[PDB]
Subunit: 501 residues, 4 copies
């Protein structure tokens, strides 16, 4: 198809796409490997906030008791989160705090979730929980100052509409939990932004009921959160993998758009919507995450997601993750943009490529976005999602582009099934679970995008680009003005160099 | 032609090719840019020695006088070589010291060489020159230890057979300068290895006569040094460039082979031969240095030069160079393997590819070298040197390589006119002289070798590679055992992932 | 009194004292904090080996069971020890491997030890344990090379004579565990050094019985391991401390001596003796560890312990530890040489000071060690251990040292109750449990030794040092050659500078 | 002297004292050593601007001709200043540009200044000099953008009232050069701040005459610049030293104040005054720079200089400097805050101490400055400048400070003749010209300030500090609130640790 790019544009592409990114549990942030991947992510994409589970779980170790004279008394150990949040602020990223799970010494029952056994029961004593929240938020303000902590966000719990994350999926108990948390947070400082309900899909009446619980009972709410995946239940499991079919990306966009409509009808029509988890599959052992398809699929969501929501947070930035035990191989289906040994997966490159876009929107359809940057240069990202099996399945794109600058330097970066894909080459190596240093460096070189460059002289103030994208390709194309300095090199003749003309 | 690679090899490919590398003047080693380049060269190519001019020239500033009690007395200022030689040893490289040029306060005349004005006249007092040599050598021993300094090499002066480097190209004055320096060095310690005569090509009788001089007067000598280039004097000039025609690589190898024979017919038949400079062109402003042709040309030399000499030192590791003034553009025909902003030029990847070869030499002709490493893997560099003008001129090559290892992972890296080639992309950018940071990063990215990988199974203990090499391509092919772990992934099926089979 | 230092010494002070250092459990090696601590320790102290628990425990996560073709089969996950052992080797340290504790899926019972719950029961199947040992040692050889792995050591289990560490303190069942482990290690490669019984003090008949067991059933043993502490059982507890009284250092040296003699009477008289754990207190929450007293105590051990044993491993290099939960304040009584935030405790300086000592032992008594270095310089460590309460309690020492110089430069470094002691300043700060960054930097600053320097000219070939050591001071004195260059500064007069003479 | 420090102050202590710092010539900024020093200075004292000579001198290399056809034509080589200014900005410092000296290819005559021979003659053609300024200023805008370059400052020449720096000290010829330069800069962009006349002391009529010339003839001026020193001509020289008597600090402040009054009476009454160089001695080989006296002298200036001027630029940040050849010894009387090897001099610590001061001024006299900061802590810098000879000469200072905070933590840092003084210890080592790495590390350690800390309890709402300062001491005293956490450590008893009470 032939697309004619207009010279200027009315609308502005937002940075909503990189507002937030997900993570494995906060206690894993103590790992050097974790910080390795986070530094890479902050250099090449730079997210504003980071969101995961386990702030209050026992590895991070904040809530204890502590026998004094003859009675159990609370003790708040900030050793670990002080280091964790410090390490975050040093990398220019703030916590999108999630309060959870339940500390053991505060839990009412035995039910846990994950390999790491986060306790998912309500607190035995709601006043002890309140006091925990006040202690934690108060500490954060003591350490980092009120101005800093006022920029953070505070979600209460996680997926209370699923039985695995909250006892009996108890709607009313969660609302009580929400109100105690919300009010405890405001009691420390009224500007702090608290929100919920952090639910998985399939049950959006919870968002209607949540916002009505808060209206009726005058309970604070500053944002709404929901999670969004497109995978069905596993159709085949091995001992290490879940395999799942996926709905197309418009299904996710519809989810975003549907939840925003439910907010617009509610008694709090102005509330921000934060999609605090999203990916194709919701399982950390689904190999789909390691593929070019995942990138081409996510590219579509990056292009449009921000039209409906204030943020959507890719779960996750890193394979440093233990919800289903320690990764059993290098490419093991983890959620991360970044694989162990800081090896970028195809999806990472899609973010990177979006990070080259300018604020000015020239054109956008279901397979491309075209922008103008301040300097006058064009930056476009194009993608060829093909969810069906088969080879070939190429897509041609004909881009007529307005530009006054008489010559143009075009730099294209590509990742697809052949290039920027460490997963493909890892198969060639024999799928080493625990590869050598040298196999890993080779995987790191191969994981880099394939670059091609050209110079093109304009005809009639317009350039034509013929772009062939192969199956599940995502590509960045930057088009810059050539200020040719050749004529300053007086006498220059390449033909005077052996072999050249 | 079909190349049958034997499974075993008797001969051993020596590491002579990276004994020593060349540099711009030692005062330039104080620059941060210099040290960035050397760090990159030492990580990707481990050179043992580094050889350049200007140890005794005035920017380094060792030789001074100094009015004390009505008398002009020597002062030896080691502030700068201390720092320089320290930085060398920290990067695991030792100085192939070159004694020169003439300190101004000790010069007999006015004649200089280069924009930096190295003085090229005899010492006004030969006893003060000797005292200089003794104080410097002694200083090295006091600072670093006798054992360390004893592993160094000491070449005396530079190209005395050229009027530009030595007043009148005075043979007997040079032999005298050599003699005073050689005895000065030995008087500090008899195991310090001293040599000469450091001549350019064109007059090899100087080697014959030099050794007859040392024989008659029993002047200590421990190696013969010589420089070797294949460029004719320039046939065109701009304010910016010297352009030169080149003879083929066989011309240089014959120069090596000629000088070795001359040492064998002499009264010191066993002397080591160090070619302390080599490249295609001897001009630091000949663009040929920046091209893929240079890379293929030199790969020929890296493959065989060690057959005839103990070392051959590429002039130079880096464009940090001022013989013909500060560089006037990013790619300005400088000698270096690395360009400003630490951008590898194509020749750098030739050195890097040779660094991947094993000790065991399995096969070699005029266009390839195939080797076996200690772990049984195969490693070959192939080049397609085309000096003639024109397009295409591709060379197909057929390989029959034995490996009992029944499946194989092949990693190929290529640098040619299209890949690994910053120069090409600089030109497409309009030859920016002083590029932006953004342009430099793109040129760095494009400067990386293109990588192709495949898996292949052996039929009958053997693999057959059909390889295509474009114009002036150099390429590294590594062939590793696949230890396939796929069977341990029970129930793995890529066809259960969206879009894959 | 007065000490006449002899100019020459017969004896050598051995490097035994820094052969090995202890660590918190291996899974903690994944922390950034841990690795910052190791780097500091490896730069300032030369440790060769690193010994700790948890290798086979479930955080590191090697042993898993996995359902394949309808049976429970072993899966060995090397993801984490690959990264751990990689990071050890990159910092020039190798594992003193300790095979333990019991993986949960292989345990025969439910008894655990520590906050992190390592299982302390026998394996439910000894053949599976064996296959576990074999798979781990084989994986090491595969990744690191057989020559690398042969330099390691392999301890079997931990304190099997203590009921907390091993079911019933079952002697005969530990011997069985040793045999199955030792024969499995030898089956992989016969050079691999294996030993035990890794007992705590109080029941040294276990060494005699362990060696008689290995003699009678021809079981491979390459060393005897043993733990040494001087602390009585805690006489007071708070919710975060154990306080304990200590025996003097001679008690530890006698423990070393008495165990060595037991080896020499047994059927393996020549076997190496590795004290794989030692410190004053055996509790990771006894504040004595954070004090100048600890450093004074342990310096006496460093000075003599090598006389009796091949190695004695200070438990531990770092407060990065979790046996009794996450540290509840900055200085919490941890074992570490280094405190969180890379703050060196006084004991760390004791090790640093011993790292400056020379080979040649000139003199030693129970309060000093005086040595000569290869360059002729003198290095001495002195300590004033004072276990009794009160102020003052100084030791005046007089040293008559010979030197072959004529003028000398004396650099003294000191750590005591006032200087190089962050615990004291932490107290002055109000004992902040979770100090700010600003406070931490102040604590690091103040943690640095105090330095005093002087020049002193000899008389009659000799130097008379008067030295005052304060309560529990450890101090380094280096006496070096002055090569006065003042005479080359002709006309120099500090009296011409404003205010000076 | 008993000082009662008020609770609140009406005035602000300005940041003018670290607005700018001086440097050796801009070409030396290419040195790794230089950037090591700049980084350190920028980490501990964050200066905003850096001011030095030689931008247009031929080592940096900007101006060349360049034979084309048969005519000499201008070529502007931006290779080196691009690297220099990039490195400045990456370290958060901007150029206070000084246009000079004269490029040889533009020079009218052959007179030069310094070891490095900057040419101090007018341009042969003022149109060529204009075309140079336009090319340089324009290139700066092209690379860094117009907003950034407008924050810089542009001074014309150096000390044109001194015959050494400018042919004949020709007043009218400098005004002509100012006019051509100023108009040139303004023709690129009118908001660029240009000024002069950069004079040395002893003839302040030049400032009057400059400003009248600019008013009458409507030449752009945006600031006045002037240099200030207090050293008399040398009374003794050696081959390597100038020794000079110093006027007291009142003389410098009186210089500042005098020039400010001349501007206030001029036709441009409101012009900023920048003192573009200042120190005690004006000679780069006067040992006084290396001393504690220099530090105590400069502190009075840092305390008050900002009263009269908009900036005052300490000449220099670093001993990396070649005006009078390469440093002949480690401490050689160089201008730098930082000695070679990154060793801080006593004067460096003065600046670091001032960098801890708060904005709100509580109390100031001629020997101390006392401030409050945002968090409520008190920071004070005290100094005891003694310019006469003699030992002892201690100053007792009694501070009576208000705090209701219950108790306080006092951190004191001292640099004087005994502590923080590497010069003193370098002499003890026998004044090594070219010390070993090991002697250098010792001088670094010894160069760190001496720290003392204490907790003091508030009696009656007031803390009474008694501070004995030794001769030529400068010292920082921070007083913070103790939030005591001791009572949360229930049961804590240091008396339960061996030896402690
Ligand atoms: Ca040079
Ligand atoms: Ca532990
Ligand atoms: Ca200079």
């Amino acid at each position: 198809g032939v697309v004619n790019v207009p010279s200027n544009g009315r609308e502005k592409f937002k940075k909503n796409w990189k507002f937030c990114v997900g993570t494995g549990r906060l206690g894993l942030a103590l790992q050097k490997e974790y910080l390795d991947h986070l530094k890479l992510v902050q250099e090449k994409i730079g997210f504003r906030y980071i969101r995961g589970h386990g702030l209050l779980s026992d590895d991070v170790g904040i809530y204890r008791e502590v026998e004094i004279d003859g009675e159990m008394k609370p003790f708040y150990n900030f050793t670990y989160i002080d280091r964790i949040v410090d390490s975050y602020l040093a990398l220019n990223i703030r916590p999108f705090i999630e309060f959870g799970f339940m500390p053991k010494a505060l839990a009412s029952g035995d039910q846990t979730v994950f390999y790491w056994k986060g306790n998912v029961t309500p607190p035995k004593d709601y006043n002890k929980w309140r006091d925990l929240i006040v202690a934690v938020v108060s500490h954060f303000i003591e350490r980092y100052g009120i101005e800093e902590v006022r920029t953070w966000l505070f979600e209460v719990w996680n997926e209370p509409n699923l039985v695995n994350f909250w006892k009996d999926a108890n709607k009313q108990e969660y609302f009580k939990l929400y109100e105690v948390t919300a009010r405890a947070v405001k009691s420390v400082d009224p500007h702090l932004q608290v929100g919920g309900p952090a639910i998985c899909g399939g049950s959006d009446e919870w968002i209607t009921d949540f916002l009505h619980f808060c209206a009726e009972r005058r309970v604070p709410v500053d944002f709404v959160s929901r999670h969004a995946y497109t995978s069905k239940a596993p159709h085949k499991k091995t001992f290490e993998y879940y395999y799942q079919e996926l709905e197309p990306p418009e299904d996710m966009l519809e989810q975003f758009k549907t939840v925003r409509a439910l907010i617009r009808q509610s008694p709090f029509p102005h509330l921000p919507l934060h999609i605090t988890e999203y990916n194709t599959s919701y399982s950390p052992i689904n190999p789909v995450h390691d593929t070019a398809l995942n990138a081409a699929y996510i590219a579509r969501i990056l292009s449009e997601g921000g039209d409906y929501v204030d943020s959507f947070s890719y779960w996750t930035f890193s394979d440093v993750f233990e919800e289903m035990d320690v990764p059993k191989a290098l490419f093991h289906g983890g959620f991360g943009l970044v694989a162990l040994h800081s090896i970028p997966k195809p999806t990472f490159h899609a973010f990177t490529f979006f990070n080259a876009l300018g604020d000015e929107l020239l054109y956008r359809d279901g397979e491309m976005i075209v922008t103008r940057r301040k300097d006058g240069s064009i930056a476009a990202v194009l993608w060829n999602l093909v969810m069906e099996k088969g080879e070939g399945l190429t897509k041609e794109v004909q881009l007529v582009i307005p530009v006054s600058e008489s010559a143009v330097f075009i730099k294209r970066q590509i990742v697809n099934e052949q290039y920027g894909n460490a997963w493909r080459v890892w198969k060639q190596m024999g799928r080493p679970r625990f590869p050598s240093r040298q196999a890993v460096e080779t995987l790191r070189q191969v994981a880099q995008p394939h670059v091609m460059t050209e110079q093109r002289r304009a005809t009639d103030g317009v350039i034509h680009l013929s772009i062939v994208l192969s199956k599940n390709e995502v590509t960045l194309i930057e088009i810059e003005q050539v200020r040719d300095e050749t004529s300053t090199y007086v006498g220059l003749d390449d033909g005077e160099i052996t072999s050249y003309s």
